[PDB]
């Protein structure tokens, strides 16, 4: 019954904090484009929604734009999770789960999402899980320490994420740990932890 | 492939402006509960989302709450449009379409939804149409004039929808007219 059910191959989700070197890690799979469906984080869509840069707006004014931004993230994630494909392996940078369990959760805690906004997002996630099929067979967790991650961001061209405080990266780190190490979260499927230092 | 495809009976959508007497019109179907799937507008859900009243918040502060509220409306509409059922006929108060074509569209125009917010909503609507099945066989349009509708709202039990200006109901009226008269089958009824 679920949308896109049984239309998806073996799927690997690349998880990790901001600045854990996910983009770098995924470049290594570039040359396998022919046999591997390789979907990077849809940052591009988020940067340009018919001209509006939601990502910049979210970072510049979280109390106003987190809700629409995250709602859009969720959608783009679903578009990735369900895009049809010939290939026998699929690899996604981040997932609907990291969006729900880390980023939205953290934006609730630091006041960016108000209860009414958070609840709306959660109702969507609840509906999505009952009615849309999300293939997830293996997660590769690029585990790093907040400080190493902070450093990596600092060594890169000024982006929109560049101003996030070390405090934010700590909050996010603990949330990934809760989900993928302390298994504190519905997620079922195997996690392969890699030390990215 | 689409979710809830071929799992839905003949469906009638009751459309009409706020205060066009849709609730009244639907009470007439009450006694047919046994053979008719009868789904009223999920106002109740919108009033209470784990304790948050999104409807009140939207009316009190549109620039802040329209986006989340409308996002929620869309979801509750999908929940209704896809709820499974035995019955051979289904009747829904309002629909995902009225939400998209009238209310969201109007909220864009009067500045309540900024372009970033509006586009987010539209992207969802686009996704929804390509991937979820929305059964709609007949629309009953309860057509009325803004003024009759406004008077109506005034008599009734003061809600959140009280404070609304006649200007708003005019905007909404024209939007329904554009959708339902000026380009499935529409059955127009004069509700005056
Ligand atoms: O759910 C999310 N929320 C986010 O804010 N982001 C952001 O996009 C950027 C790259 O991904 C990073 O700053 C973070 C990603 C997500 F997946
Ligand atoms: O898409 C919608 N937007 C809305 O604001 N409403 C509101 O709920 C009320 C109708 O029930 C009225 O205030 C209006 C209904 C909808 F269907």
Curated annotation (Swiss-Prot), chain A:
Changing residue 53 to D: Reduces enzyme activity towards dT and dC about 500-fold. Reduces enzyme activity towards dG about 3900-fold. Reduces enzyme activity towards dA about 900-fold. The keyword Transmembrane helix does not apply. It catalyses: a 2'-deoxyribonucleoside + ATP = a 2'-deoxyribonucleoside 5'-phosphate + ADP + H(+). GO terms for cellular component: cytoplasm; mitochondrion. Subject to feedback inhibition by dTTP. Monomer. Deoxyribonucleoside kinase that has a broad specificity phosphorylating thymidine, 2'-deoxyriboadenosine, 2'-deoxyribocytidine and 2'-deoxyriboguanosine. Specificity is higher for pyrimidine nucleosides. Several anti-viral and anti-cancer nucleoside analogs are also efficiently phosphorylated. This is Deoxynucleoside kinase. It comes from Drosophila melanogaster (Fruit fly). The gene is dnk. The chain holds residues 12 to 208 of 250 of the full protein.
From Swiss-Prot, chain B:
It catalyses: a 2'-deoxyribonucleoside + ATP = a 2'-deoxyribonucleoside 5'-phosphate + ADP + H(+). Keywords: ATP-binding, DNA synthesis, Kinase, Nucleotide-binding, Phosphoprotein, Transferase. Transmembrane segments: none annotated. Substrate binds at residues 41, 59, 70, 94, 161. ATP binds at residues 16-24. GO terms for molecular function: ATP binding; cytidine kinase activity; deoxyadenosine kinase activity; deoxycytidine kinase activity; deoxyguanosine kinase activity; deoxynucleoside kinase activity; kinase activity; thymidine kinase activity. The active site is at 93 (proton acceptor). It is an enzyme of class 2 (transferase). Belongs to the DCK/DGK family. Monomer. Deoxyribonucleoside kinase that has a broad specificity phosphorylating thymidine, 2'-deoxyriboadenosine, 2'-deoxyribocytidine and 2'-deoxyriboguanosine. Specificity is higher for pyrimidine nucleosides. Several anti-viral and anti-cancer nucleoside analogs are also efficiently phosphorylated. This is Deoxynucleoside kinase.
């Amino acid at each position: 019954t679920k949308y896109a059910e049984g239309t998806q191959p073996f799927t690997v989700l690349i998880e990790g904090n901001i600045g854990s070197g996910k983009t770098t890690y995924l470049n290594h799979f570039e040359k396998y484009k022919n046999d591997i469906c390789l979907l990077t984080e849809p940052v591009e869509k988020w940067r340009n929604v018919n001209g509006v840069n939601l990502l910049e707006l979210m970072y510049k004014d979280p109390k106003k734009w987190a809700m629409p931004f995250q709602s859009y993230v969720t959608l783009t994630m679903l578009q990735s999770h369900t895009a049809p494909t010939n290939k026998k392996l699929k690899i996604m940078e981040r997932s609907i789960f990291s969006a729900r369990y880390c980023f939205v959760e953290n934006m609730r805690r630091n006041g960016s999402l108000e209860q009414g906004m958070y609840n709306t997002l959660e109702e969507w996630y609840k509906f999505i899980e009952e009615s849309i099929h999300v293939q997830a067979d293996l997660i590769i967790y690029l585990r790093t320490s907040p400080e190493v991650a902070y450093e990596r961001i600092r060594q890169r061209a000024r982006s929109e994420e560049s101003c996030v405080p070390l405090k934010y990266l700590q909050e996010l780190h603990e949330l990934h740990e809760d989900w993928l190490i302390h298994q504190r979260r519905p997620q079922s499927c195997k996690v392969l932890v890699l030390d990215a230092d």
